[PDB]
Motif scaffolding. Structure first.
Motif: not given
Lengths: 335, 335
Positions: A264-288
């Motif tokens: 809806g138009d709810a200002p407090e509402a959020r979409l939460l995406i859980l993922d590994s982000v390229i360029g903003e992951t740690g060294e372990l993330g690059k390995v995985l």
């Protein structure tokens, strides 16, 4: 500490990995679950050559999975206890799946995968991973893969919950949430909150049983069907947990549009995406990311690529909060 | 720290092992030997898909083998440097050999080997390891194997030279000492001493060149031929390093008897056997016996076994001195 010591240690750990794999496949941790057993006994129980079984058991004791016991016997050690199938927090799944011959061959064809552009597993078995595991003859490998995914969720649970303020929301909706493992963790950490589970008819029975084991049947509404159909409305937090790696942009936009229309138009509402982000992951993330390269056709996205999709759905990024050394929570606002 | 953390870490280090293998097989360290290159350049140099090469290269960076460098480039980190063939202290051999498909498949068949009694390598291959490596079609793996053996020798060199007093002998006889690596180490630790290198004609030229590169040509006599003929007489130290591991009892005794009569009756003359001793090795040693189980048919011996063998040849064990967490120096005396 030095480079030489690190290389030599990777060589050693490779062997330990095989050792643990063989111990698990012979169900030695399960045979030892009620106490120590002699080599001769374990030989009869596995159908093994006593002299070579002893050498394997001894290696397992060297890696601290078992411990050697008087009268030529062996007994579980803490690390070996976790390789029992019956252990509530077992890790037998990840220890066995990734060292399975069919799987190990795929990581072997990593070179030809990089040269060709085809995932190594498909290159090796002429078929995608999920189709390979669907065959009745590979049920044992399928169950181990299923267990591995549960174990990775268990291992990284605290990393999410201590890296983002889920307490801000009261009604969660996990799109593609499977048995409801993540939804359970959030509803446990956030009192008086309710949830909605959205997934296909495959995990329906698995969800009801797991939610009942957590006493969350009253707080979680299970919705079964296609994403574009049973998508719930009136939730202040929507969660996409690693279910856009295998989606085309056009398909993902429609989903994200449908989600936008639902919150809806709810200002407090959020979409939460859980993922590994390229360029903003740690060294372990690059390995995985090696796992994605070997096994599947999907791929992680950069921040710019996420902003492109989200903008076409009426979303903006508030931030990308790190969640450990691999994962992150992409917080999204409407309009 | 926890058992759970250790188990997850073995899973990760397994992926790293594969990453380092693929990096070495693509000769990326050698391509980067003279400075940084872009992904595009490395793609053309290897004939790889740029998109998937970058993900592989980024993974190698995460594992601290390479470094990411501005403008989509990569260069050598210290650990990657050791994976160059041309590095003086190279470790490319051990990092590639144990991850080769034919070798990796053997470590996978560890279960059937324990169940059958046959070395795992010989289950998937019709020939034993050395016969296999001898073939021209397996030269690439043969050369990685030989490098691996040189690397392990370099890695454990100090462990011997600091755990036993070689300095109390003045004439060494390295029986089966290959190109002279061990003998060279000992002669450098004992400034006033000479040596005799005894080995087959397979490594005659290799031994002359290596000794010349160490300026030991005037201090080492190189005897080429069958062991039972070219045994030197009058040496106060005889060394058997990884020889009797695959010799039968009846054969080993004969060799030991021949050494025994070559030592004379000098009360301080010793036979030093360098090996891993079952029941008197460290946790690492128990793990490394896996290699013996997977690759070859030979086996390490217990102390009692060594007692019985040496007894038939007229030797007495003075002591078994620990040389690190794997190997030991078995000090033997003529009765």
């Amino acid at each position: 500490r030095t480079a030489a010591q690190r290389l030599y240690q990777y060589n050693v750990d490779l062997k330990v990995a095989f050792v643990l794999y063989a111990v698990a496949k012979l169900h030695l941790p399960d045979l030892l679950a009620d106490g120590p057993r002699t080599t001769a006994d374990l030989a009869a129980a596995t159908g093994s050559d006593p002299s070579r079984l002893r050498r394997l058991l001894r290696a397992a004791a060297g890696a601290d999975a078992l411990r050697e016991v008087p009268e030529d016997s062996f007994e579980l050690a803490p690390m070996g206890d976790l390789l029992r199938s019956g252990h509530p927090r077992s890790m037998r799944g990840m220890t066995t799946f990734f060292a399975e011959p069919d799987v190990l061959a795929a990581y072997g064809d990593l070179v030809e995968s990089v040269r060709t552009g085809v995932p190594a597993f498909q290159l090796r078995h002429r078929e995608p991973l999920y189709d390979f595991l669907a065959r009745p003859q590979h049920k044992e490998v399928r169950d181990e893969f299923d267990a591995a995914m549960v174990e990775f969720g268990q291992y990284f649970a605290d990393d999410f919950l201590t890296s983002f303020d889920f307490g801000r929301f009261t009604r969660f909706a996990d799109i593609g949430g499977g048995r409801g493992q993540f939804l359970a963790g959030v509803l446990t950490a956030v009192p008086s909150s309710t949830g909605v589970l959205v997934d296909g008819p495959a995990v329906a029975a698995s969800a009801h049983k797991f939610l009942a084991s957590q006493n969350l049947t009253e707080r979680v509404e299970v919705r079964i069907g296609d994403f574009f159909d049973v998508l719930p409305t009136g939730c202040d937090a929507y969660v996409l947990r690693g279910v856009l790696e295998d989606w085309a942009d056009a398909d993902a936009v429609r989903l994200l549009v449908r989600i936008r229309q639902a919150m809806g138009d709810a200002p407090e509402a959020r979409l939460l995406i859980l993922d590994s982000v390229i360029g903003e992951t740690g060294e372990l993330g690059k390995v995985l990311d090696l796992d994605m390269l070997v096994l599947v056709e999907g791929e992680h996205r950069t921040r710019a690529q996420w902003d492109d999709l989200l903008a076409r759905a009426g979303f903006d990024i508030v931030g990308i909060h790190p969640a450990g050394d691999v994962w992150a929570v992409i917080e999204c606002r409407g309009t």
